[PDB]
Amino acid sequence: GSGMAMEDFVRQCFNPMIVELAEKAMKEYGEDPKIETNKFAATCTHLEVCFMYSDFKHRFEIIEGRDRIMAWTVVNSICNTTGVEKPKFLPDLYDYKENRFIEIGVTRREVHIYYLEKANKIKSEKTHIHIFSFTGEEMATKADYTLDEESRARIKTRLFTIRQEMASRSLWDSFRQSERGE
Ligand SMILES: O=C1c2c(O)c(=O)ccn2N([C@@H]2c3ccccc3SCc3c2ccc(F)c3F)[C@@H]2COCCN12
Ligand SMILES: [Mn+2]
Ligand SMILES: [Mn+2]
């Protein structure tokens, strides 16, 4: 259940491309993945979900996984060619079919609680929110889940698998409790 154990878990259970992008994002925002090991795992998990979401004719542009400048450059380019309003906060994806940005949330807590937190932090009723748990639960803006049932099933399964792999190593309890502060 240690810090070293969690860092080792992350580097073993996530593909090297995900790990590298997560490390770069954490450094960009001033956090050390060797100290904030649960956050390291959280960023890898969330990045993987974004990449799995964008697979499932490229319907989706991935904003996440890019450095800050390139992320906003992509966002501005989309807004210039679609007239969609520029979001105040960086989103995770752009849906070319529905022509809307998407914010992806992954939570170790109840989805309704996290969904409210997300909706409150953005306040822009134009970014579509989609929350996943590690328990197979899901909540999205207007109960519009965007993807088909099978695509969401595989994301839920992968998240549950991560949870079980953590639990087998006694890492899940720590990971769960670090999402929200005291
Ligand atoms: O893109 C995100 C982001 C999300 O998209 C999200 O859903 C939750 C959280 N985020 N944050 C991610 C992040 C992403 C995934 C899981 C946990 C965290 S926790 C804060 C943090 C993030 C990235 C690097 C870092 F050092 C951080 F401390 C930051 C929020 O500022 C815009 C960029 N960003
Ligand atoms: Mn993001
Ligand atoms: Mn997100």
Author numbering: -4 to 51, 73 to 198
What does the paper say about this structure?
To verify the reduced endonuclease activity of the I38T mutant, we purified the isolated endonuclease domain from influenza A and B virus polymerase with either Ile or Thr at position 38. For influenza A, we used residues 1–198 from strain A/California/04/2009 (pH1N1) with truncation of the flexible loop (Δ52–64:Gly), as previously described. All four PA-BXA co-crystal structures exhibit clear and unambiguous electron density for the compound, which is bound in essentially the identical fashion in each structure. When this residue is mutated to the more polar threonine, the structure is essentially unchanged in both the FluA and FluB structures except for the side-chain of the residue. The side-chain of T38 is orientated such that its methyl-group is in exactly the same position as the CG1 of Ile38, whereas the OH group is orientated towards helix α3 allowing it to make two hydrogen bonds to the main-chain carbonyl oxygens of Met34 and Leu35. Thus, substitution of Ile38 by Thr38 reduces slightly the van der Waals interaction with the compound since threonine lacks the CD1 methyl group of isoleucine. Furthermore, unlike I38, which does not change conformation upon BXA binding, T38 (and M34 in the case of FluB) have to change rotamer to accommodate the inhibitor binding. These two effects (less favourable van der Waals packing and induced fit change of threonine rotamer) plausibly account for the reduced affinity of the inhibitor for the I38T variant and hence the lower susceptibility of viruses bearing this mutation. The results show a 10-fold reduced activity of the I38T mutant endonuclease in vitro for both FluA and FluB (black triangles). Although I38T mutation confers reduced sensitivity to BXA, we also show that recombinant influenza A viruses bearing this mutation have a significantly reduced fitness in canine and human cells, as measured by growth curves.
The heterotrimeric RNA-dependent RNA polymerase (RdRp) of influenza virus is composed of subunits PA, PB1 and PB2. It is responsible for replication and transcription of the segmented, single-stranded viral RNA genome (vRNA) in the nucleus of infected cells. Transcription of viral mRNAs occurs through a unique “cap-snatching” mechanism. We initially screened metal-chelating compounds by CEN enzymatic assays, followed by a cellular phenotypic screen and then optimized the chemical structure to improve the pharmacokinetics and safety. This culminated in the generation of the compounds BXA and BXM that target the CEN in the PA proteins of influenza A and B viruses.
